[PDB]
């Protein structure tokens, strides 16, 4: 399929699994632990997701070592997928610069080869005329 | 009319739209569930907010299957509706740039443009003499 | 056989405009240069334009400036010149006519090979 | 920019006879002038090139001098048709270089 939308679609499906794995993970290891409730997958399933959009709404949430060592790479990993297609849009923002200042080189780099061209050719003309005056009159 | 105003006032108005349907989605949805205090429009109101700008003051919030679907959109359209005006902040300042730096383009073309056209005035101003120097000393 | 057809005369309501062409028919316009040469109704010869379009250059008399446009086409074989803000005294009849570009003893013959013209009649 | 004075402002002579006509160059014009003849009508027609030589099949009475600066045309023992409007042109300026001369209209007498 169309790239943009496999290097999209990837940020996309990686998000995905992550959100899915922190729901996965941070499930089983939050069994036996002071106040770990989230016990459950589904329950983590939306776990990992406060995780990433980092909001934390503060119902379901890990208490161990390990549980919340895959919580803060949910964290991260969130913060990730969104820095990078936040600074993705702005290919096509500052990447419209490019073509104002490529469709700018144009009339500028136009503008000028008329001017010098045009004085080489001011010079053959130039230059016969005079080569003209010469050998023509004498011979 | 305009039209940074059309596109831009189009992700707003399909901002508030979302941010008026998780409100209305999100209310009737969580009807009869475990914890669901989310039953009221004005209160789901302050929580689609708490989503989009990824808050989660933790104390208005879905249950359900279908409530949290609505849920995870809200926060997606959120990071998506500032992390365009951010890109957007980006464009906008490299972009003023391009206009100081394009005026750069004036200084250093149209000094360039007239300099090779004051050299043309002289190229024929030489000739111009020879041709006399020698239509003047010989015929 | 070398010749030119002058074309595009007529009448013109004073200050609007025309463009007359001089499709040439022996040579190649290319390698040679364009004359168009006028003459009021019954008065005397007035040149009003050139254009050598081998060294890419025109030129025009002071009688007109702001105002006429010669240029030409090599792609077809034809000099146009683009009167515009046409006058009063402008009617006449545009002939165009050759000389060679500035080159081996050519340039000497004047305007070798003259056209018919055509009669631009400016008038309210 | 090169200007032309042509004289006589208007000629008449009869056939046989032979017709000088004069032209001074406001300005220098290496041996750059032409001769045309107009027949009321018709487009000019080249006689004289370069001010010397005549254009490929042209009357042996058609002539030109140069006087440095004054250029004349001389038809020696006019003919009966030769009559016709004549103009004076300079080729030299870079003012791509064509300038006429006035004229000088020789009508033929009887």
């Known amino acids: 399929s169309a790239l943009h939308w496999r290097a999209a679609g990837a940020a996309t499906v990686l998000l995905v699994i992550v959100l899915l794995a922190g729901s996965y993970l941070a499930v089983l290891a939050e069994r036996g632990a002071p106040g770990a409730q989230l016990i459950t997958y589904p329950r983590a399933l939306w776990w990992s997701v406060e995780t990433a959009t980092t909001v934390g709404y503060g119902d379901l949430y890990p208490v161990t070592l390990w549980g919340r060592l895959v919580a803060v790479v949910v964290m991260v990993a969130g913060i990730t997928s969104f820095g990078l297609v936040t600074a993705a849009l702005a290919t096509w923002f500052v990447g419209r610069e490019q073509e104002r200042r490529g469709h700018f080189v144009r009339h500028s780099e136009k503008a000028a080869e008329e001017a010098y061209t045009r004085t080489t050719r001011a010079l053959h003309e130039r230059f016969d005329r005079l080569e003209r005056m010469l050998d023509d009159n004498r011979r | 009319s305009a039209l940074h105003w059309r596109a831009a006032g189009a992700a707003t108005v399909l901002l508030v739209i979302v941010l008026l349907a998780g409100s209305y989605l999100a209310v009737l949805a969580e009807r009869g569930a475990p914890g669901a205090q989310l039953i009221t429009y004005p209160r789901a109101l302050w929580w689609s907010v708490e989503t989009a700008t990824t808050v989660g003051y933790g104390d208005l919030y879905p249950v359900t299957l279908w409530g949290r679907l609505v849920a995870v959109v809200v926060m997606v359209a959120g990071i998506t509706s500032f992390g365009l005006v951010t890109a957007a902040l980006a464009t906008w300042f490299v972009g003023r740039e391009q206009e100081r730096r394009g005026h750069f383009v004036r200084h250093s073309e149209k000094a360039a443009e007239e300099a090779y056209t004051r050299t043309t005035r002289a190229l024929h101003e030489r000739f111009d003499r020879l041709e006399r120097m020698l239509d003047d000393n010989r015929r | 056989e070398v010749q030119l057809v002058e074309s595009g005369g007529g009448l013109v309501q004073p200050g609007g405009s025309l463009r007359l062409s001089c499709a040439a028919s022996?040579?190649?316009?290319?390698?040679?240069?364009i004359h168009w040469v006028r003459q009021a109704p019954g008065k005397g010869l007035e040149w009003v334009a050139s254009?050598?379009?081998?060294?890419?250059?025109?030129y025009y008399a002071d009688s007109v400036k702001g105002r006429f446009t010669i240029s030409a086409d090599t792609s077809k074989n034809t000099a146009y010149l683009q009167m515009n803000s046409l006058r009063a005294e402008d009617t006449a009849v545009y002939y165009c006519?050759?000389?060679?570009?500035?080159?081996?003893?050519?340039?000497?013959?004047?305007?070798?090979?003259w056209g018919q013209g055509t009669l631009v009649t400016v008038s309210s | 920019d090169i200007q032309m004075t042509q004289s006589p402002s208007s000629l008449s002579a009869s056939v046989g006879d032979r017709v000088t006509i004069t032209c001074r160059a406001s300005?220098?014009?290496?041996?750059?002038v032409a001769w045309y003849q107009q027949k009321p009508g018709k487009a000019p027609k080249l006689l004289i090139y370069?001010?010397?030589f005549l254009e490929s099949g042209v009357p042996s009475r058609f002539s030109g001098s140069r006087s440095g600066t004054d250029f004349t045309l001389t038809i020696s023992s006019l003919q009966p048709e030769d009559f016709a409007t004549y103009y004076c042109?300079?080729?030299?300026?870079?003012?791509?270089?064509?300038?006429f001369g006035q004229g000088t209209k020789v009508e033929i007498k009887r």
């Open positions: 042109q300079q080729y030299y300026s870079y003012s791509a270089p064509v300038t």
């Open positions: 006519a050759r000389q060679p570009s500035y080159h081996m003893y050519s340039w000497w013959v004047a305007l070798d090979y």
């Open positions: 300005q220098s014009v290496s041996s750059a």
């Open positions: 022996g040579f190649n316009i290319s390698s040679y240069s």
């Open positions: 254009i050598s379009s081998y060294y890419s250059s025109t």
């Open positions: 370069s001010a010397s």
